[PDB]
Amino acid sequence: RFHSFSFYELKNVTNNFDERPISVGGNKMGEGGFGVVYKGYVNNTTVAVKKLALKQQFDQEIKVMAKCQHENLVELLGFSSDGDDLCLVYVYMPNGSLLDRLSCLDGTPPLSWHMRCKIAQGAANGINFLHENHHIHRDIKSANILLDEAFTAKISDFGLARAVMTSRIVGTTAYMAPEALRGEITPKSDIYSFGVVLLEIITGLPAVDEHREPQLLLDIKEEIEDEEKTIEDYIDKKMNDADSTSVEAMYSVASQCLHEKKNKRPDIKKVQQLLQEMT
Ligand SMILES: CN(C)[C@H]1CC[C@H](Nc2ncnc3[nH]cc([C@H]4CC[C@H](C(N)=O)CC4)c23)CC1
Numbered sequence: 001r002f003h004s005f006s007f008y009e010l011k012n013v014t015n016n017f018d019e020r021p022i023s024v025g026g027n028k029m030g031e032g033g034f035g036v037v038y039k040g041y042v043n044n045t046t047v048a049v050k051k052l053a054l055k056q057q058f059d060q061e062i063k064v065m066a067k068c069q070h071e072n073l074v075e076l077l078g079f080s081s082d083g084d085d086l087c088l089v090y091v092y093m094p095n096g097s098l099l100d101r102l103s104c105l106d107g108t109p110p111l112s113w114h115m116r117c118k119i120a121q122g123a124a125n126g127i128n129f130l131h132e133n134h135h136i137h138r139d140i141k142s143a144n145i146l147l148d149e150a151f152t153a154k155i156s157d158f159g160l161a162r163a164v165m166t167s168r169i170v171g172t173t174a175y176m177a178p179e180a181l182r183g184e185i186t187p188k189s190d191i192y193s194f195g196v197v198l199l200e201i202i203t204g205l206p207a208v209d210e211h212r213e214p215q216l217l218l219d220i221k222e223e224i225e226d227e228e229k230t231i232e233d234y235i236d237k238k239m240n241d242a243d244s245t246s247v248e249a250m251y252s253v254a255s256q257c258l259h260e261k262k263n264k265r266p267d268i269k270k271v272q273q274l275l276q277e278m279t
Helices: 007-013 055-067 098-102 111-134 188-202 217-225 243-258 267-276
Strands: 028-032 035-042 045-052 075-080 087-089 145-147 153-156
Touching: 007 035, 007 045, 007 087, 055 075, 055 087, 098 145, 098 188, 111 145, 111 153, 111 188, 111 243, 111 267, 188 217, 188 243, 188 267, 217 243, 243 267
Parallel strands: none
Antiparallel strands: 028 035, 035 045, 045 087, 075 087, 145 153
């Protein structure tokens, strides 16, 4: 099981929940709609503390994380429920998110094609574990693929995860399958979202850019298919080791995951096999 941390302990290790960025000497790593993420130091070890700011997503995170322990999923160390605020304690990921590394946020070097292939394989191994254990993530995106000291991919944020139709449509629209947008709950929707992640890895482009044509990255599949553009035209130029053949083998996997008809998309086990054959 997990550790029950006291609020006071979490308060002094996050320097009284210092909201100043790390870049100016504070403890704030990033904020989202459901809280603030702080850098902490417990057992000399660095930790990530999400102080929540909702209670259902707290319990859903603990529920899914108690059941799901894999090499390619972030690990939750514990939580704090007793004290003024709810916190979630995780293992620290020194290389942040795949989104940030692909955008080279804060001046970090571009990821090589070799690093990118491993991350794709890793993230897929994580999705396969989730699907084998009958869980649908519902928010597969690069911001939710974290990177450790060896740049091993770790799927994060199981707040919207589910063990089919719903009224409460959730996820990130730039990554969502057409049927997910209509209200269907299916593991096939996670496959589609992973296809967008593969496109981000090949291109280094964000899934949505309001000041770009096309605004949505998934739309380049149409441009390539209708021979208006090539996959080579889109390949991230911030790489020196991107081999044409393996880039084409990854784009084929991405194109397959982005099939508009959910039943024509491969299952996650087929995705792993395809990404393995690529290397
Ligand atoms: C924009 N950018 C600066 C981001 C800012 C947040 C960072 N988060 C992390 N950083 C390093 N170690 C980590 N371990 C675990 C996590 C996250 C914490 C938040 C959790 C949640 N349920 O929302 C998911 C797991 C984490 C990632 C980078």
